[PDB]
Design a protein around this ligand. Structure first.
Ligand SMILES: CC(=O)N1c2ccc(-c3ccc(CN4CCCCC4)cc3)cc2[C@H](Nc2ccccc2)C[C@@H]1C
Length: 109
């Protein structure tokens, strides 16, 4: 536990988890369910908010930056895999803007 990690849990994840655009990101991408047989060929490090949330709850992270990289990986995977005009890109951008806004007011170590 750190000051920064508590902030990431109580402020950042709390905000993103309940957001109306959060639902595609709350569990790992299921390539079979979604019919995306190339997903794991293009995206080599899958990440999602359920995984990040569980990690925060279970004190997985050693530094706040590690959690921040997981958030970043989740959004970046979405931008890399999807078509520029797909709605999910707009949903990712909306959540990430909130991520960055909140991270601007995170404690220093
Ligand atoms: C996160 C991500 O990159 N993706 C992802 C990851 C997960 C899901 C996803 C997650 C859950 C469900 C099941 N939902 C149950 C509740 C009601 C809506 C369907 C369906 C798709 C979708 C998506 C995206 N598809 C999509 C389609 C229409 C609107 C928004 C997004 C493509 C893409 C592979």
């Amino acid at each position: 536990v750190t000051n920064q990690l508590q902030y990431l849990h109580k402020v950042v994840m709390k905000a993103l988890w309940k957001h109306q655009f959060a639902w595609p990101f709350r569990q790992p991408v299921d390539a079979v369910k979604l019919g995306l047989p190339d997903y794991h060929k293009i995206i080599k490090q899958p990440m999602d908010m359920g995984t990040i949330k569980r990690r925060l709850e279970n004190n997985y992270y050693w530094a706040a930056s590690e959690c921040m990289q997981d958030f970043n990986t989740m959004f970046t995977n979405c931008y890399i895999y999807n078509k520029p005009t797909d709605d999910i890109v707009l949903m990712a951008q909306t959540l990430e803007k909130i991520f960055l806004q909140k991270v601007a007011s995170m404690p220093q170590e």
